[PDB]
Design a protein around this ligand. Structure first.
Ligand SMILES: CC(=O)N[C@H]1[C@@H](OP(=O)(O)OP(=O)(O)OC[C@H]2O[C@@H](n3ccc(=O)[nH]c3=O)[C@H](O)[C@@H]2O)O[C@H](CO)[C@@H](OP(=O)(O)O)[C@@H]1O[C@H](C)C(=O)O
Lengths: 52, 394
């Protein structure tokens, strides 16, 4: 089996670990749907403001 | 670095706001492509720009900054974000990296945990690129897969799958925190046509592309063989799924489980009245009595079985075949007792037999204005509902 197929199976395990472990599930879902970071948002504001 | 293709305009009609957001989005993506891609790679949570995704690109547009605006502006900025992702896909492939041999496509219905699954993947030395996107209409993915095969890269496709209802619950939570959920129209369109697109891809490329699945209904079960992936993903037609989703989002709003803003983003551009009118009650009836009403469906064996029971007082005995109900003609008043109601339809016994009203009439909700067992007249004066009670005692 390829490295990609092994990578997907190991991801499926951590999907199962999200269902039992609630501290693990909160730390994953915190990052995903936060938005841009304060560092990146500083860069973006200059980029947007420089080109109107 | 120019964009890989032209950004398709959508017609927003008289919506002047979205029309202007679209143009400002296309201008930004076209003119600042070099600086946008640089910020995507070096600064966002994208594995140095190896995780490629149109949804992550939306965060670099100014219209998408505020949480309140995301559901509204999404369709106006999407195509710019998608073409930037396509441009980014191509720029990653241009990097001369002999060690990196693998390209992974992640696809599936919105709210099935694709991005959470991608976070739970650990990057490897051989991983070149990971692209999250729809393959239900796979024409654009053909150009992507084609380029991978030109450079002798190993292409894998992961089809993540989940029930439409459980997936819809995950998009609600996403909408309330992130600000973007997903429309039922696109959820049904992806889920119904994803098996066709994968099969279409399979015929075209064969063993060169490897297609696997993840069943999220069975604790993230990995599905190795292509025939098993098609069985997992075969969860009904586009009419069925859209029908079930239309009733779900409406029921959830009527009960007070989701807000009006969550309901509207899920509704999207859909005319729900038109979806509800397509629903069939062909093998269905309602039995009434002093205790209440009982919904029953008949199976191929010709046995009626009870689906639902609703206690109501003051009804006489009766059997009503819902599949033989006359559709209410607009601009006419129908008088009589309501014998059954659900998310899609309202069934009223008149003196000219059983009559069926849509539960919505020009975005006004008929169902909430009447109760089962109640005697009413229902008429529409110039696209405005007129419901009068006819209850009396004498
Ligand atoms: C179908 C659609 O519009 N959106 C869906 C599609 O995005 P996508 O980026 O794969 O959608 P394409 O526009 O079909 O782009 C595919 C390719 O088509 C070329 N292209 C595209 C546009 C254009 O103008 N010109 C052009 O050439 C280009 O090569 C691009 O890579 O897949 C995502 C991942 O499942 C969905 O996001 P989530 O499931 O994560 O919510 C997304 O739907 C969510 C709910 C939402 O939209 O908000």
């Amino acid at each position: 089996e390829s490295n990609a197929i092994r990578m997907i199976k190991e991801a499926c395990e951590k999907n199962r670990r999200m269902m039992t472990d609630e501290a693990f599930r909160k730390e994953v879902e915190k990052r995903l749907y936060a938005g841009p970071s304060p560092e990146l948002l500083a860069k973006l504001r200059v980029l947007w403001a420089a080109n109107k | 670095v120019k964009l890989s293709s032209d950004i398709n305009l959508r017609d927003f009609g008289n919506n002047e706001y979205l029309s202007s957001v679209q143009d400002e989005a296309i201008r930004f993506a076209t003119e600042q492509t070099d600086e946008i891609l640089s910020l995507y790679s070096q600064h966002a949570d994208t594995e140095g720009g190896r995780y490629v995704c149109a949804d992550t690109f939306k965060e670099l547009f100014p219209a998408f900054e505020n949480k309140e605006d995301r559901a509204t502006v999404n369709n106006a900025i999407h195509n710019s974000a998608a073409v930037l992702s396509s441009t980014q896909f191509d720029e990653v492939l241009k990097r001369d990296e002999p060690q990196k041999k693998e390209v992974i496509f992640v696809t599936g219905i919105p709210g099935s945990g694709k991005t959470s699954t991608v976070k739970n993947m650990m990057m490897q030395d051989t991983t070149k690129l990971l692209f999250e996107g729809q393959l239900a209409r796979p024409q654009s993915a053909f150009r992507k897969i084609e380029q991978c095969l030109e450079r002798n890269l190993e292409v894998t496709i992961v089809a993540v799958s989940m029930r439409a209802e459980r997936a819809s619950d995950n998009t609600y939570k996403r909408f309330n925190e992130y600000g973007r959920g997903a429309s039922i129209g696109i959820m049904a369109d992806i889920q119904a046509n994803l098996p066709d697109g994968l099969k279409q891809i399979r015929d075209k490329f064969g063993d060169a592309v490897k297609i696997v699945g993840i069943n999220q209904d069975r604790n993230s079960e990995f599905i190795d063989k292509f025939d098993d992936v098609i069985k997992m993903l075969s969860l009904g037609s586009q009419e069925q799924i859209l029908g079930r989703l239309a009733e779900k989002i409406q029921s959830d709003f009527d009960s007070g489980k989701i807000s009006r803003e969550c309901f509207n983003q899920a509704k999207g551009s859909m005319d729900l009245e038109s979806v509800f009118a397509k629903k069939e009650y062909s093998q269905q009836r309602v039995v009434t009595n002093s205790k209440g009403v009982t919904l029953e469906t008949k199976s191929a064996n010709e046995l009626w079985s009870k689906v639902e029971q609703i206690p109501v007082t003051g009804m006489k005995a009766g059997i009503y075949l819902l599949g033989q109900a006359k559709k209410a003609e607009t601009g006419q008043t129908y008088s009589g007792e309501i014998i059954y109601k659900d998310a899609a339809a309202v069934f009223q016994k008149t003196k000219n037999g059983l009559v069926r009203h849509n539960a919505t009439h020009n975005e006004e909700r008929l169902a909430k204005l009447v109760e089962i067992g109640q005697n009413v007249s229902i008429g529409s004066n110039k696209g405005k509902l007129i419901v009068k009670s006819l209850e009396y005692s004498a």
